[PDB]
């Protein structure tokens, strides 16, 4: 099932439990907790649907909202789990080597553990220090330095 | 964890799920995969291994269209939960399955 959309059989209000509220680039929120629970409350305390929500997911409608049914309540990338940004501002890239840790596809790879992962915090506005960024194998960041990315946004991670 | 760190080794053939701290509690999943029943008992408790084995066994039976009460599996699970291992002494017992 390549479709990441979650269908709702009955008009039950979503009850999200064991989640982390992180402000995203829009009114929706991104969950940074691996374990999450979803429940539907229509007219009584009995739940109807549970499903499962992976980390780095964006909910279509807020928690406790009476969902009309038949529409997606949360959307997430079914292949990659995005890594959220705790600090909003320019992306600080440390020890960026061209020709060894650069793979042209701007969208450029970060580094390769086998070939050689510097850790740095996201800049406040341009280069201010404010968070540890870990780059596993085949990790790629499409945001260059000075992109001034806001909190709750993530580029393609390209899992190994 | 404040004291007594748990040094665990991963042969790197399996990806590590939780990258940040997130205050990982006991029984949390470090990496994906089908968990052994032994691991659930050691960390999550007796009640968890009872619920896991019942659901796993009843899933096969329910798929074929067979009705078996859950009391008949908990009875058998009880018979597999004997022979504790002792980690303390003073009463003629020291590191032995009894």
Tokens encoding B72: 């008949």
Report the alpha-carbon distance of residue A126 to residue A123 in Å, rounded: 6
* Class of residue B59 by CB neighbours under 10 A (exposed 0-12, middle 13-18, buried 19+): exposed
Q: How far is CA B94 from CA A55, A97, B3, B42, in A?
A: 45, 58, 26, 19
Report the alpha-carbon distance of residue B63 to residue B81 in Å, rounded: 27
Is the CB of residue A35 less than 8 Å away from at least one CB of chain B?
yes
Give the B window 1-20 contacts with A, CB below 8 Å.
15, 17-20
The residue behind tokens 């691996």 is: A34
Cβ-based contacts of B29 with chain A (< 8 Å): 34-35
Cβ-based contacts of A159 with chain B (< 8 Å): 15
- Please name the residue of chain B whose CA is at the shortest distance from the CA of residue A113: B12
Give the DSSP per-residue string, B61-78: HHHHT----THHHHHHHH
Nearest CA to A116 out of A141, A140, A94, A97 is that of A97
| Cβ separation A134–B19 shorter than 8 A | yes
Q: β-pairing, A108-111 with A57-59? A: unpaired
Reported structure resolution in angstroms: 3.4
* Class of residue A114 by CB neighbours under 10 A (exposed 0-12, middle 13-18, buried 19+): exposed
């Amino acid at each position: 099932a390549a479709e990441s959309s979650i269908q709702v059989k009955n008009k039950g209000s979503i009850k999200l439990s064991n989640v982390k509220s992180v402000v995203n680039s829009s009114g929706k929120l991104v969950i940074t907790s691996r374990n999450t629970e979803l429940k539907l409350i229509d007219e009584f305390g009995r739940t109807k649907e549970s499903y499962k929500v992976p980390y780095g997911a964006v909910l279509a409608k807020g928690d406790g909202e009476q969902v009309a049914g038949g529409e997606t309540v949360a959307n997430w990338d079914p292949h990659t789990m995005p890594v959220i940004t705790e600090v909003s501002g320019f992306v600080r890239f440390t020890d960026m080597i061209d020709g060894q840790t650069i793979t042209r596809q701007s969208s450029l790879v970060v580094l390769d553990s086998a070939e050689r992962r510097p850790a740095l915090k996201i800049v406040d506005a341009q280069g201010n220090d404010v968070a540890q960024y870990f780059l596993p194998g085949k990790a790629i960041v499409q945001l260059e330095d000075g992109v001034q990315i806001s909190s709750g946004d993530t580029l393609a991670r390209i899992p190994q | 964890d404040g004291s007594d760190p748990y040094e665990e080794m991963i042969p790197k053939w399996r990806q590590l799920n939780v990258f940040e701290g997130e205050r990982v509690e006991r029984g949390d999943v470090i990496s994906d995969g089908p968990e052994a029943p032994h691991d659930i008992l050691r960390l999550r408790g007796v009640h968890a291994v009872t619920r896991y084995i019942v659901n796993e066994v009843q899933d096969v039976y329910r798929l074929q269209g067979v009705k078996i009460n859950d009391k008949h599996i908990e009875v058998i699970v009880r018979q597999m939960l004997r022979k504790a291992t002792i980690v303390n002494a003073g009463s003629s017992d020291f590191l032995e399955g009894e």
